[PDB]
């Protein structure tokens, strides 16, 4: 069983979007709307915007799971390379297990999941509606290894699957974007757009 | 491998380790398989003091990676102003052109770094330079809704 990457708006019209630029003092991330591809530096804050048109049920959650993009890799679980897993950098005493590629920043109720059968790793947050007079629910993600890391992703491309789920794990909506964790997001975005 | 250690220390911002590795004979112009040098990596990451000490110890300000980008391209794309200034003083070509026709001004204008756009213009950035698709820096500022940058570029036209 491979995780589905199929877009599914579902009954709440679930959608995932990105603000026009980083509010950091530098392009710590940038999003290609042409390629539906996030570019970020390792461990930097990446705000992702969730929109629904009708409230999800009580107990709904938002999952983020990385998967390899290419059919020849998709059965392999995406995790941090051993070097980043075992580093002391970013690995101070904390809730995120050090193997997980995706973290949530700034949420005490973020939950790190490893399926005991599939070995798939993902991170949940409770669904929360937007703060009054805003359009979006913001989730802050951190991506904790470089795409190039030889002991991990090893230059293979990944997709981030964002799923809206009931408390009991029924799919309510799903959106997918490609992610690259790279040295220079601003250049990589333009270079990739140039190549297509 | 001292080269590999120097690349990593420059990227992640370990200034003391950069100094120690170069004292131990690390190649200041080491490149990875993407052609990124310590100076590229410090420039993209935004580590000003590392950029300075690499240039003082013989880093190549004109080195191009596998995309044809110089360290100035990377600092300009990221918005690292003081690094852009140091690279220009050290001999960077303001109009260095990568293999898909981007100048530093293309990348600053596109990603939307107003202060960088201003400094590049003062050093002779070419407002007429076209990428592989015919786009000028102004075209890219319009395409990515960078209104203040598009205005500055129009005045420089
Ligand atoms: Zn890694």
Residue numbers in the entry:
A (entry chain A): 125 to 320
B (entry chain B): 3 to 159
The authors write:
Here we describe the characterization of Designed Ankyrin Repeat Proteins (DARPins) that were selected as tight binders against all folded domains of p63. For the initial development of DARPins as tools to study the p53 protein family we have focused on p63. This transcription factor is involved in the proliferation and differentiation of epithelial tissues as well as in genetic quality control in female germ cells.
Using ITC titration experiments we measured a dissociation constant KD of 108 nM for DARPin C14 and 32 nM for DARPin G4 while no interaction with a control DARPin could be detected. To identify the exact interaction interfaces of the DARPins to the p63 DBD we crystallized both DARPins in complex with the p63 DBD. The structures revealed that both DARPins bind to the DNA-binding interface and interact with the helix H3, the preceding loop and the C-terminal part of β-sheet S10 as well as residues in loop L3. All these sites are involved in and crucial for DNA binding. The loop L1 that in p53 provides an additional contact via K120 (conserved in p63), which however is not essential for DNA binding, interacts with the non-randomized scaffold of the DARPins, resulting in steric hindrance but no specific interaction. In the second DARPin-DBD complex within the asymmetric units present in both crystals, this L1 loop is disordered. All contacts between both proteins are summarized in Fig. 1D, E and Supplementary Fig. 1G-J. These data suggest that interaction with the DARPins competes with binding to DNA and that the DARPins act as a competitive inhibitor for DNA binding. Pre-incubation with either DARPin C14 or G4 resulted in complete inhibition of binding to the DNA oligomer while a control DARPin showed no significant effect. We further investigated the specificity of the selected DARPins by ITC experiments. These experiments showed that for the DBD a selective p63 binding DARPin was not identified since DARPin C14 bound to the p73 DBD with 16 nM affinity as well. Virtually no interaction was detected with the p53 DBD, however. Co-expression of DARPin C14 reactivated the transcriptional activity of p53.
